[PDB]
Amino acid sequence: MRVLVSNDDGVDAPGIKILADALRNAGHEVMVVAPDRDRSGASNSLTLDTPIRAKQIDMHTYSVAGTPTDCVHLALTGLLNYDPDIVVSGINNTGNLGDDVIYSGTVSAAMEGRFLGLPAVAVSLVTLYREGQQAPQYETAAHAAINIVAQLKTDPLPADTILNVNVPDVTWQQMRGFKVTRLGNRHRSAPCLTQTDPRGHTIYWIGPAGPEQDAGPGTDFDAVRNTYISITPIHVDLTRYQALENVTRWTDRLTAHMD
């Protein structure tokens, strides 16, 4: 089939190159449109007050001076002569779990995919802090992504949600299987710490997570801790339909009161 690929770490990052290469080896057509540098720490909104620049790198690749949402939007509304079947965003160099999901740049590019009418997937590798060096297993995450893509064709899912995927950092021979999960939480517990800096000013640190967190059986945290790949289905429309009838009766009692 025909695929469109983006990310939030930049067009020159090791994980986006390994992903696109594997997809082509498997027999697919692939075009890449991604940011000119790393965008972590930047806001995810569409750019409306100023114009945007882009340049061709090779016959299949373009570099854009804007957000991950800017990259997917321009690709689908006039930048390319191309009609894709699906959007895939990643492979990210750290995990995207629990309370981190609503503000993730990797997730924002997949969202713009569905808004414009196509199915979409985000993929992330769960790396762990060390001292020296140990090279990350991007090859392991790519093998999972090509099998997910082929299957979405032979047995299609409805088109009103996005899939968020997280992969343990090991060789494939160690993996135990797949599991379907819900979002956990881990920073409701973080109780601030008071200190003094080298020039005499009072400063504050957000605390580390305690044991009273929500990361048990059924959650995304618990699956990856036990060496399984995690898949969570998420909303694309923030409207809460199941609450409309009740809020209307509430608003009626409000207006009768004041006037």
Query: Residues marked as binding?
Result: 8-9, 40, 92
Segment 5-64, which members bind Cl ion (CB under 5 A)? 8
Of 3, 8, 120, 167, the one binding Mn ion (CB under 5 A) is 8
Q: With contact defined as beta carbons under 8 Å apart, do 116 and 76 qualify? A: yes
Query: Is residue 44 close enough to count as binding its own copies by CB under 8 A?
Result: yes
Query: Is residue 112 close enough to count as binding Mn ion by CB under 5 A?
Result: no
Of 98, 105, 119, 168, the one binding Cl ion (CB under 5 A) is 105
* Residue 84-113 contact track with its own copies, rule CB under 8 A, x = bound: ---------------xxxxx----x--x--
Of 1, 21, 37, 40, the one binding Mn ion (CB under 5 A) is 40
Query: Is residue 70 close enough to count as binding Mn ion by CB under 5 A?
Result: no
Give the integer Cα–Cα distance in Å for 28 and 32: 13
Instruction: Pick what 148 binds: its own copies, Cl ion, Mn ion, none; C-beta below 5 to 8 Å, kind-dependent.
Output: its own copies
Count of residues of this chain found to bind Mn ion when the rule CB under 5 A is applied: 4
Q: Is 163 helix (H, G, I), strand (E, B) or coil?
A: strand
User: Which letter, b or e, does each residue of 155-164 get, where b requires 16 or more Cβ atoms within 10 Å of its Cβ?
Assistant: eeeeeebbbb
| Angle (deg, nearest 10), helices 14-25 and 138-154 | 40
Give the integer Cα–Cα distance in Å for 37 and 175: 33
Query: Is residue 49 close enough to count as binding its own copies by CB under 8 A?
Result: yes
Three-state SS annotation for 166-212: EEECCCHHHCCCEEECECCECCCCCCCEEEECCCCCEEEECCCCCCC
Query: Is residue 199 close enough to count as binding its own copies by CB under 8 A?
Result: yes
Question: At closest approach, how far in Å is the CB of 20 from its own copies?
Answer: 19
Query: Is residue 203 close enough to count as binding its own copies by CB under 8 A?
Result: yes
Query: Is residue 129 close enough to count as binding its own copies by CB under 8 A?
Result: yes
Q: Is 122 helix (H, G, I), strand (E, B) or coil?
A: strand
Q: With contact defined as beta carbons under 8 Å apart, do 166 and 178 qualify? A: no
Query: Is residue 59 close enough to count as binding its own copies by CB under 8 A?
Result: no
Question: At closest approach, how far in Å is the CB of 52 from its own copies?
Answer: 5
Q: Which stretch binds its own copies (CB under 8 A): 22-30, 86-94, 118-126, 173-181?
A: 173-181
Query: Is residue 147 close enough to count as binding its own copies by CB under 8 A?
Result: yes
Give the integer Cα–Cα distance in Å for 200 and 202: 7
Of 83, 135, 192, 216, the one binding its own copies (CB under 8 A) is 192
Q: Is 218 exposed, middle or buried (0-12, 13-18, 19+ CB in 10 A)?
A: middle
Segment 213-232, which members bind its own copies (CB under 8 A)? 231-232
